[PDB]
């Protein structure tokens, strides 16, 4: 697979990758640094790279959410689908554990707090269209 799309979040924010690796959400729609590249690497394990910025979005051994062009095992996230029909994205560094989440302020969240059901942890793929 290969999937080009905007990653909408439940707290009405957009995942945006700064061209210096800053990962925060944006409210503006037609930004450009919010367009992603959903890539399949194995099972039901996926990797995302923002087309413009070119970085990757990862989770370190302790939880932080950063980015780089240097892949690692920190770049691997598993893509679930709760029955609400929303996806989730947990890490590979170790129920469910840590997910890609976003406060209602645009700022991301630290692994040691995420949880399956909360809204922050629910994102929604949408095409550029």
UniProtKB/Swiss-Prot annotation:
Glycans are attached at residue 87. Transmembrane segments: none annotated. Keywords: Glycoprotein, Growth factor, Heparin-binding, Mitogen, Signal. GO terms for cellular component: cytoplasm; extracellular region; extracellular space; GABA-ergic synapse; Golgi apparatus; postsynapse. Disulfide bonds: none annotated. Coiled coil: none annotated. It comes from the Eukaryota. GO terms for molecular function: chemoattractant activity; growth factor activity; heparin binding; type 2 fibroblast growth factor receptor binding. GO terms for biological process: actin cytoskeleton organization; branching involved in salivary gland morphogenesis; endothelial cell proliferation; epithelial cell proliferation; fibroblast growth factor receptor signaling pathway; hair follicle morphogenesis; lung development; mesenchymal cell proliferation. Belongs to the heparin-binding growth factors family. Interacts with FGFBP1. Interacts with FGFR2. Affinity between fibroblast growth factors (FGFs) and their receptors is increased by heparan sulfate glycosaminoglycans that function as coreceptors. Growth factor active on keratinocytes. Possible major paracrine effector of normal epithelial cell proliferation. This is Fibroblast growth factor 7. It comes from Rattus norvegicus. The gene is Fgf7. The chain holds residues 63 to 194 of 194 of the full protein.
């Amino acid at each position: 697979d290969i999937r080009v799309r905007r990653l909408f979040c439940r707290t009405q924010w957009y995942l945006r990758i700064d061209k210096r690796g800053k990962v925060k959400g944006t409210q503006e729609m037609r930004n450009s640094y919010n367009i992603m590249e959903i890539r399949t690497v194995a099972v039901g394990i996926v990797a995302i790279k923002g087309v413009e910025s070119e970085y990757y979005l990862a989770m370190n051994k302790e939880g932080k959410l950063y980015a780089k062009k240097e892949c690692n095992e920190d770049c691997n996230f598993k893509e679930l689908i709760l029955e609400n029909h929303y996806n989730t994205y947990a890490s590979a560094k170790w129920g469910g554990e840590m997910f890609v989440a976003l406060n209602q302020k645009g700022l991301p969240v630290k692994g040691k707090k995420t949880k399956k059901e909360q809204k922050t942890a629910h994102f929604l793929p949408m095409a550029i269209t």
